[PDB]
Design a protein around this ligand. Structure first.
Ligand SMILES: [Fe+3]
Ligand SMILES: [Fe+3]
Lengths: 557, 557
């Protein structure tokens, strides 16, 4: 048998098979399996040599991943699944993996039933330093089993600290994964990991490769049987596909929600734009803002940049005094304090953005403390909505910090200064200044303080959300005005490609691509078709990306 | 001289006159004066006898006052200023007070200039137990000097504890009086008090008569000179009147402002009314509400009462458990704790409603602590608007109460239980129940806890305020839905006429007239033309009026 002999003889053993089936039944957080030394060692070694010689990999980055890919449409990589002339051992490998013998074994052990022999579906990738793939579930088309076979250097151990682990996520409830994974596989040469695609449950990611090493892998799927094949059921594939395509936005936090401003605030903006800030007001603004941006010609420049670009990208936004305070407290927190790296360890005043197939980061919203570990925790928040109060948040912090005891390890100097900044941007006078720059009258606000931790945190490309309560107001612009004050004290972002960049783009469609920097302020007027995200922050980053995020509904006045 | 001899000879003395003028210059909070034993003692005694015999007084109550009046249009009281046939001594009194001799003296001493001799303007009133007149400034028409001459029993001293004192208010800024008066006059027989009418400043009230005594007084005004009189200037009166008829609503607190609800909340209301509450939801509601109002026929009755009356007046609203908790903590606070009786003594979590010519009461709004003693205090609040957070307010209370030390004199058991109630009414599920009862979908909320102190607190007849931000939404009803949960544990309200009643009326125009009671819930859908106030609470009340005030914008769904 020229097929069975290309695999480890153990997999053909009935006792081993039942042993594997049981392992998979008993696995967590959802059913998955692994086999060590799957394939004939010579075969896989020759496949790896073929790949190194014949295939050229191109790095590709999106919001969701960074991967060295080989699946370019025109087959410039050297990989063509219709013509493996230069890769005969790879041909052999595909053949054995989709053989009847292997499919019967694999379908039995995973309890997946029958599998297509003809619908071969494989891709070849390498992960180098900084490469990663963010949380997803693999539920696409006729995919029934997901697999990865790993081909790192066959003569060295691939270690935990190298990263690139495969990580699996428990679920708070269907289609809502918990933020933190509960299992991680560190995979060696000739190891395969796999699982039955479970819509709503099979959430996994690839942990960033943290080290200067190349990790080659062959990824693939087994599909529902096609016409003419064993186990083929007419209608099954279509039934499956449509049944895998609302209520879920309830489980997202923080909410993309703005609170309306008081009458006092709005009439101050209206009055001004029916152009003039008093000297007392400039004095209040100069507490925080750089004099460059408060001068008459400075303001005039900003105003005209906004008319032209419908955006501002301001450098050295905050004055020297406040810039120095903030840099000192943020730097001190980064270098001398420990940072929570699991959502259960996050304490007041911080919250974890959830769910992880949409985003992950730490934020201060000014709301009552919230730590979402169960459906119950979430349902409770939804029954008892509260609104931000920064001064109370500030108060609470002082209680905790003062007993405790205000040491270099546990102080809240960063948080306190950041909240004072948030308070300044919450002030009536600041919003008057905003209206001055933009000729737009703010009618609502949401202010968030954000930390994007190295090796954890990210958002994905999304649109703004309007409130349908304000949709019928004809004065209200069909746009959300969005501010980002970046306070990232570390370097190497652009050169090391460390991620953490703020990206705005149209449905070159790129409006802004800004690596994190110190004391910049971006202002973007977003219509419905503008996408924004901040790229996943690499483990190699020397600090978190810290910023203050601001969102306003506006009318023209 | 038959006029000069009807007054105390001292007033004709130059030295006395300059002495009085100086007193008035040096008085506070604005210039005012008093003269003891003004009139010939026999004259005033005979005037008082005439009044008792000839004039019949009718009690009259509005939002602003309760006074025994004699100025009925048809002159049924016996008082007719055009025919004082039966009151010749009163005729004499009016004559002397508006004589040239007296006017010259009075105009000199008050620095008011010339005064009309012919435009006599006097009214006669008695204040009995519970009578009072709330804060006002007297700036009406051609009024130049305001005066009161007091005719209590000439042979007994009128004491402080009797009440009926004349009280004068300092100003936080023009037309914004401070909540608490800074001077009080206890007036005797034949005493006159007076002041130049000062638009924006001359704020005064009449302290409630706290005792079972009758206090007769003659009130009057000196007006700008009319045609043909000394000091007459053509155009002056009209210039004055028009120049005494916006920015001021900034100095009112609390704001008539509602915050918009989250998307999660609104879609729950929409979904339900596109009729059905789950058993888990009824279980949550039964934590607080009486089972009478949660049953299917109970609900059905409420629903139909609301369709008919556009209001509900529910008795025994809260269940026995919560009713008993609340009664115990409120009663305990009333009988064993001291209550702040000046706005400077009010502590967290309480705020004082201001300004006092619009309202006075204590409230819990869930916002950061605020105590308005200066313009600065107010300006600061307006530059830094915050939103309610009840849980943080609750947290802060525990800090203060626990050190401190949780005694019978200083505990916050009332406040804590009341806030828990406020939290329940802030819950998504309660608002679902509200929508069930009303077939209206709440889109915003404001919740306040109120205490109306005996002898201090009141509101005046006002309309609801819509937000013009939501005016263009066609789904949004042109009405404010308003709830009042009354938790007043004391009796005697209706029989003692102790005020504190909730009054709703059309521009019989009376919709609701409800004396305070225990555990009632009123619901009123107010259009623009519905007026509401709660009547000033008498010193004789055995407790404050305690309630929870709720306001929602609604759409029809
Ligand atoms: Fe995957
Ligand atoms: Fe008066």
């Amino acid at each position: 048998d020229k097929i069975k002999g290309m695999f480890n003889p153990k997999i053909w053993d009935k006792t081993f098979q039942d042993g594997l089936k049981k392992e998979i039944e008993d696995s967590q957080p959802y059913n998955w399996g692994t086999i060590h030394e799957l394939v004939n060692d010579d075969l896989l070694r020759a496949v790896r040599k073929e790949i190194e010689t014949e295939i050229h990999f191109t790095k590709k980055e999106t919001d969701i991943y960074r991967v060295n890919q080989s699946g370019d449409l025109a087959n410039l990589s050297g990989l063509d699944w219709d013509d493996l002339s230069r890769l005969p051992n790879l041909f052999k490998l595909r053949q054995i993996l989709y053989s009847k013998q292997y499919r019967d074994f694999f379908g039995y052990v995973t309890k997946a039933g029958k599998l297509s022999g003809s619908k071969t579906d494989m891709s070849i990738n390498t992960y180098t330093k900084g490469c990663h793939l963010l949380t997803h579930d693999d539920v696409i088309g006729s995919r029934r089993i997901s697999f990865i076979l790993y081909l790192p250097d066959p003569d060295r151990k691939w270690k935990s600290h190298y990263g690139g682990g495969l990580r699996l996520f428990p679920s708070i409830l269907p289609n809502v994964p918990h933020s933190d994974p509960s299992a991680k596989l560190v995979p060696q040469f000739n190891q395969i990991a796999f699982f039955k695609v479970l819509p709503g449950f099979s959430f996994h990611d690839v942990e960033e490769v943290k080290v200067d090493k190349h990790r080659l892998s062959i990824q693939g799927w087994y599909h529902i049987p096609q016409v003419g094949e064993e186990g083929y059921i007419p209608g099954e594939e279509e039934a499956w596909v449509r049944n895998n395509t609302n209520v879920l936005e309830d489980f997202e936090f923080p909410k993309d929600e703005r609170n309306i401003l008081s009458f006092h605030e709005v009439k101050h903006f209206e009055k001004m734009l029916k152009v003039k800030l008093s000297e007392a007001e400039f004095t209040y603004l100069s507490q925080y803002i750089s004099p460059e941006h408060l001068s008459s010609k400075g303001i005039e420049k900003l105003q005209k940049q906004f008319v032209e670009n419908s955006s501002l990208q301001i450098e050295s936004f905050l004055n020297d005094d406040k810039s120095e305070l903030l840099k000192k407290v943020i730097k001190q927190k980064e270098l001398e304090q420990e940072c929570p790296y699991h959502s259960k360890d996050v304490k007041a005043p911080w919250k974890t953005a959830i769910p992880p197939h949409k985003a992950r980061y730490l934020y201060i919203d000014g709301k009552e403390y919230r730590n979402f570990q169960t459906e119950a925790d979430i349902l409770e928040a939804l029954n008892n909505n509260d609104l931000p109060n920064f001064q109370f948040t500030k108060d609470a912090i002082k209680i905790i910090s003062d007993a405790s005891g205000n040491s270099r390890e546990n102080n809240f100097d960063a948080e306190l200064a950041l909240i004072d900044l948030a308070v300044f941007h919450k002030s009536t006078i600041f919003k008057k200044y905003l209206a001055l720059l933009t000729s737009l009258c703010p009618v609502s606000e949401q202010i968030l303080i954000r930390r994007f931790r190295p090796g954890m945190d990210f958002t994905l490309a999304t649109k703004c959300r309007f409130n349908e309560l304000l949709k019928s107001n004809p004065d209200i612009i069909d746009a959300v005005l969005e501010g980002t004050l970046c306070l990232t004290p570390s370097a190497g972002w652009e050169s090391g490609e460390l991620g953490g960049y703020e990206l705005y783009m149209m449905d070159d469609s790129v409006l802004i691509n800004d690596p994190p920097a110190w004391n910049t302020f971006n202002l973007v007027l977003r219509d419905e078709s503008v996408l924004e995200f901040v790229k996943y922050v690499s483990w190699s980053a020397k600090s978190s990306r810290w910023d203050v995020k601001m969102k306003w509904d506006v009318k023209s006045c």
